[PDB]
């Protein structure tokens, strides 16, 4: 019933020689991409990535594109400013990434507000949980922190975190509800692999589930074999659902003593399977 | 909707 979040993942990557830096903005509602902006395009526009976003009128798309257009200028300047802070040359390609947004609880009250920057893949600065102070990761970030402290940026930011973010989150949740809050139970099965030895391979498959979060465990009559278990990272099937598998190496003939447990939020009760 | 980012 719980907590939800609205987060924007921002990226600016310079490409000296070729033109201007590539800029992107991606919004996620509970981990699902719903809006997207990419400057490496024809006539770059804020674009809906979920069909339910289409209910937002032209106003929304113009205002959010204008907003991204200005953010894009801030990031171009950030890119040139950092090169000077670290004394790097102008030929190289560098990146800046940001994660901004909030986590809200069931009561609709703000739980957590995020604002973290990374330069070239390493942490640079981040707003603290108090929502008033920043933590710098290097000497270069103290300059930024100092500037932000002087201008009262955390305050500007906190105002967006607790107001605009929260309010919009609620609205996004109201309009994408059915799709956002949908659940597709995973279809499970077990397969047998051998390679002419005295050992077999039991692989537990979890397919076509949504959301992505899932847990698969192999048991030997009560024992969760986490040490002797081999499994892959959850991966996108490409159609909105996900896949995952967990395998264990079992003694030929001792198949029927091993059990796979499928924990997913669409399941009324956890799944339990064996070779068949 | 996203925020209006200042610079570093």
């Amino acid at each position, epitope marked *: 019933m719980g907590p939800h979040s609205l987060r924007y993942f921002v990226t600016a990557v310079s490409r000296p020689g070729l033109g201007e830096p590539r800029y992107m903005e991606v919004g996620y509602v509970d981990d699902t991409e719903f809006v997207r902006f990419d400057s490496d395009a024809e006539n770059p526009r804020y674009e809906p990535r979920a069909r339910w976003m289409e209910q937002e009128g032209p106003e929304y798309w113009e205002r959010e594109t204008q907003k991204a257009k200005g953010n894009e200028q801030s990031f171009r300047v950030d890119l040139r400013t950092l090169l000077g802070y670290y004394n790097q040359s102008k030929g190289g390609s560098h990146t800046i990434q940001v994660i901004s947004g909030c986590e809200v609880g069931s009561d609709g009250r703000l739980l957590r507000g995020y604002q973290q920057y990374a330069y070239d893949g390493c942490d640079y600065i981040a707003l603290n949980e108090d929502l008033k102070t920043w933590t710098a990761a290097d000497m270069a970030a103290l300059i930024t922190k100092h500037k932000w402290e002087q201008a009262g*940026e955390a305050e500007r930011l906190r105002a967006y975190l607790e107001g605009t973010c929260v309010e919009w989150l609620r609205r996004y949740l109201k309009n994408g509800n059915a799709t956002l809050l949908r659940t597709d139970s995973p279809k499970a099965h077990v397969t047998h692999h051998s390679r002419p030895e005295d050992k077999v391979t039991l692989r537990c498959w979890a397919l076509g589930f949504y959301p992505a979060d899932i847990t698969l465990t192999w048991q030997l009559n009560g024992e969760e074999l986490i040490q002797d278990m081999e499994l892959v990272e959850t991966r996108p099937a490409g159609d909105g659902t996900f896949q995952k598998w967990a395998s264990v190496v079992v003694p030929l003939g001792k198949e029927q003593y091993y059990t796979c447990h499928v924990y997913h939020q669409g399941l009324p009760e956890p799944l339990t399977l064996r070779w068949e | 909707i996203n925020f209006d*980012f*200042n610079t570093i």
Partner: T-cell receptor
Amino acid sequence: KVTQTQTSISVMEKTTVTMDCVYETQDSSYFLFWYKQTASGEIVFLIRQDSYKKENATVGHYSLNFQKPKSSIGLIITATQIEDSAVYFCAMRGDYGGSGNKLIFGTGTLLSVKP
Amino acid sequence: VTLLEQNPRWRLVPRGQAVNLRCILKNSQYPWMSWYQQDLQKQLQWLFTLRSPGDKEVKSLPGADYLATRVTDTELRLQVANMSQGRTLYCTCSADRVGNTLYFGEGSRLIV
């Protein structure tokens, strides 16, 4: 977007004056400012109000009366000196189209202080 | 006296003559620089904001043609032409792009 109805004001030193400012914005976060222009043309920054700051900004003998619900941001100069005679400007940021640092200015209200 | 250095202070602009204004930032804490005009009725109007050296823009208003260029990190230029009426040009500086105070230079009084 920014309107200051009064054209001019005339008072005697030591008096308290209130310059009116009414604005129109659809932004959730917004920034209001008061500037002053002397005979010379110098445009001087006086005081500002953040739409998200719950309190009325106060600086020296300049005080603001921010009435969010009425969209009013009057400038109150308490107990006036001859030095305060000038054109008072009210402004609000109102960027669009890639403007970056666009302030919208009211037409200004002239203030006079007789010795 | 401000954080900016504008020259000329004033200038007589002949009929078909273009004129050039220069603005120098004296405090590097405020790199966002703009050009504002103030008419004879005394209405301030924003014209340009150019943060990065190389930035150049052309804008034509009723009464004046303008071409602005951020030359260096501390230098903002303006070329004004086809101005049928007097007006003063002010340079402003700010510490960042959104929500930071703008501070005014002393201006360049263009007289006709």
